[PDB]
């Protein structure tokens, strides 16, 4: 007490606390309401969150991310073997369990996924402590609805290692529905669709709620579709533009690509509220400045197939839940990527004009609902 709600996200984490009948989403030391699920190791220190993501480009083999993709899994799991090929850090096998291997202070170290996630949770715990001016111990932590018992157990363990008393592990879509008060009893069942597009995954969940009890009717999605893919499309676009203007290809310069990606992600966010965004990077490659811009229309065209494709999982989830689109009582947007206007248009159009629940920052809705539930369990 106070107990907190924590969304331990694949790419960003968020912590909230319910007090005086209101949820407060807590800003970190940099004033950010969400924090990168990154941890880095150097010759002298361990960095977590914003501090870790800010040096990823210069320290690729020792900056860990995506621990959520390893948590609770066996080393021989096809998913792990597939994902490992794409990470710049090493994943080793310890008696059948995956561990990330890094260098810290000149020595080789290895950590279980739950230890890496415990570092992220320690950061979220401290963020809440700085805001509350009191020690934080009890917490509700969320996980994807498809997580199995081992993945739920390892997530709870990450919390315990961080010094938290995990009151309960609840599903992300359920937490999002709770944020909007859809758990309240209205004397009849209600069907709710959660459309969750984050930084690296896309989850569609259909919930049936009655008497405060949740039932996951169906889930669909793509574990390799998120905001990072839209950033990739923009990066490729600008590498091509720089090549045309300067007859130089920056593709093989890791730092150049990173600075460009960062500017693209920032420009993308601006495009959700404005129709154009400027990209200005000083000395991007060989001392050449890269000052350009991108319109919302071009950003939408660069990603047209990926945006439209989000509707397939929606149709499949409806089919698996044995529900027609007209039987959905509420549609809830979750994940930072749902702030993109074109995605909202596509989903609303698919639902024949039905309004979307989007008043709660989508990238905060999971933590918001977790905080409400944590207070209820406290
Ligand atoms: N205003 C915005 N417009 C567009 N995209 C945005 C905006 N704000 C944030 N994003 C994107 O949202 C993503 C992060 O979403 P969120 O914080 O919900 O991630 P997450 O739940 O950790 O993701 P994952 O699905 O990988 O678990 C990033 O790709 C970020 O660029
Ligand atoms: Cl911080
Ligand atoms: Cl459209
Ligand atoms: K998140
Ligand atoms: K997601
Ligand atoms: Mg998420």
What's the arrangement of secondary structure elements?
Elements lengths: L3 E4 L4 E8 L2 E4 L9 E2 L2 E3 L4 E3 L1 H4 L9 E2 L13 H7 L5 E5 L2 E8 L2 E5 L1 H20 L5 E6 L5 H13 L3 E7 H8 L10 E8 L4 E9 L2 E10 L4 H20 L7 H17 L5 E10 L2 E8 H7 L1 H5 L2 H11 L8 E5 L6 H10 L14 H13 L1
Parallel strand pairs: 1-11, 11-12, 13-18
Antiparallel strand pairs: 1-2, 2-3, 2-4, 5-6, 5-7, 8-9, 9-10, 13-14, 14-15, 16-17
Helix pairs in contact: 3-4, 5-12, 6-7
The chain binds adenosine-5'-triphosphate (ATP), chloride ion (CL) (2 copies), potassium ion (K) (2 copies) and magnesium ion (MG).
The site of magnesium ion has 5 residues, from loops.
Main location: cytoplasm
Membrane topology: Peripheral membrane protein
Subcellular location: Cytoplasm; Melanosome; Nucleus, Nucleolus; Cell membrane
Helices and strands, in N-to-C order? EEEEEEHEHEEEHEHEHEEEHHEEHHHEHH
The oligomeric state is: monomer
Instruction: Give the distinct bound molecules.
Output: adenosine-5'-triphosphate, chloride ion, potassium ion, magnesium ion
Distance between the termini: 7 Å
Helix % is 25-40%
Radius of gyration: 21 Å
CATH evolutionary superfamily of the largest domain: ATPase, nucleotide binding domain
Q: Provide the CATH topology of the largest domain.
A: Nucleotidyltransferase, domain 5
Q: What proportion strand? A: 25-35%
Look at the helices and sheets and give the structural class. Answer: alpha+beta
CATH class of the largest domain reads: Alpha Beta
Number of helices: 12
At CATH's second level, what is the architecture of the largest domain? 2-Layer Sandwich
The count of DSSP E runs of length 2 or more, i.e. the number of strands, is 18
Basic shape: globular
What characterizes the major β-sheet? Answer: 6 strands, mixed
- The total domain count is 4
GO molecular function: ATP binding; ATP hydrolysis activity; ATP-dependent protein folding chaperone; heat shock protein binding; protein folding chaperone; protein-macromolecule adaptor activity
Main location: cytoplasm
Modified residues (N6-succinyllysine): 316
Region (Nucleotide-binding domain (NBD)): 1-378
